Amino acid sequence: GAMAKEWLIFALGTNNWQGPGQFAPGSGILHQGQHIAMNSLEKCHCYSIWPSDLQKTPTDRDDYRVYEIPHPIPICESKRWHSMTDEEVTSYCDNLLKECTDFIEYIEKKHGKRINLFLAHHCFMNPVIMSEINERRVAQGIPKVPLVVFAHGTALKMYENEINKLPEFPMKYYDWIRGTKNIFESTGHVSGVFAVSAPQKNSFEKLFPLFPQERVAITPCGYNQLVFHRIQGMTREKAFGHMPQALYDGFDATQLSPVQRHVASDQCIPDVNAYDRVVVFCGRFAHWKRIDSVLKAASRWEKEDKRILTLIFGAGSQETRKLYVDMAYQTLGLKDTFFLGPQSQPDLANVYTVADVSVFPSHDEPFGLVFIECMGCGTPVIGAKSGGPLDFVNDEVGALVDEGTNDEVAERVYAAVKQALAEDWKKTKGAQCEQYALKKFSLASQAELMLEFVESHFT
Ligand SMILES: O=c1ccn([C@@H]2O[C@H](COP(=O)(O)OP(=O)(O)O[C@H]3O[C@H](CO)[C@@H](O)[C@H](O)[C@H]3O)[C@@H](O)[C@H]2O)c(=O)[nH]1
Ligand SMILES: [Mg+2]
Numbered sequence: 001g002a003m004a005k006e007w008l009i010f011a012l013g014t015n016n017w018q019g020p021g022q023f024a025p026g027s028g029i030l031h032q033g034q035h036i037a038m039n040s041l042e043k044c045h046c047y048s049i050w051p052s053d054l055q056k057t058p059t060d061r062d063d064y065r066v067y068e069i070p071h072p073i074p075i076c077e078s079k080r081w082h083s084m085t086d087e088e089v090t091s092y093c094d095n096l097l098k099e100c101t102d103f104i105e106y107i108e109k110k111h112g113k114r115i116n117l118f119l120a121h122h123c124f125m126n127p128v129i130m131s132e133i134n135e136r137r138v139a140q141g142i143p144k145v146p147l148v149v150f151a152h153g154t155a156l157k158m159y160e161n162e163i164n165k166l167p168e169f170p171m172k173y174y175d176w177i178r179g180t181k182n183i184f185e186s187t188g189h190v191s192g193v194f195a196v197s198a199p200q201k202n203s204f205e206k207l208f209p210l211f212p213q214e215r216v217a218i219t220p221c222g223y224n225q226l227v228f229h230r231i232q233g234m235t236r237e238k239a240f241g242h243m244p245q246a247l248y249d250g251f252d253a254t255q256l257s258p259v260q261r262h263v264a265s266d267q268c269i270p271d272v273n274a275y276d277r278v279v280v281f282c283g284r285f286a287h288w289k290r291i292d293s294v295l296k297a298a299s300r301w302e303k304e305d306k307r308i309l310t311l312i313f314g315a316g317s318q319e320t321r322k323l324y325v326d327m328a329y330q331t332l333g334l335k336d337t338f339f340l341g342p343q344s345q346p347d348l349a350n351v352y353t354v355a356d357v358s359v360f361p362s363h364d365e366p367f368g369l370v371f372i373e374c375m376g377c378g379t380p381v382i383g384a385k386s387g388g389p390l391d392f393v394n395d396e397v398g399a400l401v402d403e404g405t406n407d408e409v410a411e412r413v414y415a416a417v418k419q420a421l422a423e424d425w426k427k428t429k430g431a432q433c434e435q436y437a438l439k440k441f442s443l444a445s446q447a448e449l450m451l452e453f454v455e456s457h458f459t
Contacts, residue, residue, distance in 0.1 A: 310337035
């Protein structure tokens with residue numbers, strides 16, 4: 001070959017990117033990372049479209065557009081796809097198709113060159129739309145463009161709910177996407193599927209058994225090292241000293257003991273420099289993140305009076321916030337553990353930078369972006385021996401505790417933190433953490449591999 005492959009990519013997302021007034025789910029963070037990654041590669045341009053009922057399509061950038069919609073993004077499980085009416089499902093898909101074809105028109109005029117990769121997120125309406133966009137192009141005498149799908153799992157779970165005839169999931173999509181659209185019944189529409197985790201690859205392969213397993217693979221995932229790096233001059237007071245406690249609406253401070261009076265809604269953490277060491281969790285408040293294992297480990301170490309400060313970052317519904325706030329303060333008597341809410345990526349880099357250790361004791365973490373972000377800031381990590389972290393957490397960058405009940409994990413997390421603090425892992429592994437993360441997991445290295453994989457195995 002005389003020249004390197006030039007890529008011109010169009011990427012259709014399911015969720016919003018992270019911006020003002022709207023935090024993004026894992027899926028939307030990944031899409032945004034990938035967009036960043038691919039516009040870094042030498043012979044490569046990526047254009048993206050994604051939906052939001054709040055964020056507005058930009059005025060001074062052309063590299064992405066927002067599909068501005070009148071109601072919250074439909075969820076597989078505010079309103080659900082199965083709750084929508086046909087006319088509403090139809091016009092959501094039809095209007096999005098139109099905005100895609102118009103963006104594609106603009107892109108191909110700007111470059112005097114045809115798009116040569118479609119990327120579609122989730123195994124539902126986005127590959128249906130890009131599949132129809134391809135058929136329309138062939139009919140017009142335009143070359144078709146390989147289509148690659150990112151299985152994140154939410155659409156696959158919805159299909160299983162239809163198959164097992166759960167009540168609020170009458171069969172409406174799975175049989176249609178296999179029997180009428182035939183999206184995954186061959187390689188005629190979709191060239192390859194990237195799954196974020198092994199259970200999603202397994203679930204995809206069971207739900208779409210006519211799709212060649214050779215064309216199914218696990219997504220290489222990167223982190224944004226432009227944002228997640230050791231932050232020069234950072235301080236505890238700058239990093240989290242001005243973040244207010246984020247509890248839940250209607251939280252009653254009178255139900256708390258006197259030694260807990262520092263716990264207060266919308267108040268900052270008092271005198272952050274008095275604490276000896278800082279332990280950080282970050283994650284959405286899902287049950288499999290095992291936040292309760294973090295809170296139980298802290299119940300033990302807070303009894304030892306070593307001034308260990310524990311920070312819980314991440315979002316939850318009012319229900320899950322009440323569960324873990326009340327668990328922390330009424331059930332376990334914590335007083336040096338605080339909830340600080342969801343935060344921007346730059347704010348988290350500052351926190352990781354000043355943390356002694358992070359703990360993410362997930363049960364079957366799909367990949368574990370939080371792990372790589374934290375290490376990329378020069379901080380060690382403690383997780384569990386399940387899911388994605390098994391593949392990349394070793395003893396030089398932190399530790400994975402043995403799987404078990406939530407109570408067993410809690411005791412093992414307590415032992416791991418006590419040992420990280422005693423041996424000052426921050427000092428002895430910190431540098432290795434940033435170098436490991438930077439070299440194996442940067443956004444641009446991982447996208448490069450991904451595209452080489454598309455060319456080697458998805459033709
Ligand atoms: O307050 C927060 C919390 C999270 N994040 C970002 O969101 C990412 C993921 O956080 P997480 O709580 O794990 O959300 P999930 O939706 O559960 O992430 C899913 O999606 C990721 C990318 O596909 C995978 O790495 C995860 O394992 C998978 O669970 C973080 O790494 C951060 O980049 C923020 O920016 N602010
Ligand atoms: Mg999916």
